[PDB]
Predict the structure of Cytotoxin 3.
Amino acid sequence: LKCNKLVPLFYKTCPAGKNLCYKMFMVATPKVPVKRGCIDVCPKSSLLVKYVCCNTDRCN
Amino acid sequence: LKCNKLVPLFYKTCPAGKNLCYKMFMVATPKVPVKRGCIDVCPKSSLLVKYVCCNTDRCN
């Protein structure tokens, strides 16, 4: 599995276990991601902070 | 441990275990915190995201 990094033009291969790609942005600016990478369980989304996760290569 | 909430007007005595009050804001907007509460080890931020912790009475 491969996930993108903050900067889309780059990615990394997830380490054993972490079988997910996540995206993290503020509710205010949804199209402006601020965190990118691999993860085990999608972080809980609060009010102003959203977490989006997918299981495909470079989808986050 | 007096900890303020996402909405300053409110504050919840940070429960057992959690002995730190934090503020979560997006560097691009230091005054518009997006999260506040009780966290164990102050999460390590990045270039766009920032976490600030303290253990004083209503410090965050």
In short: The interface with chain B takes residues 6, 24, 26-28, 34-35, 46-49 of chain A (CB under 8 Å).
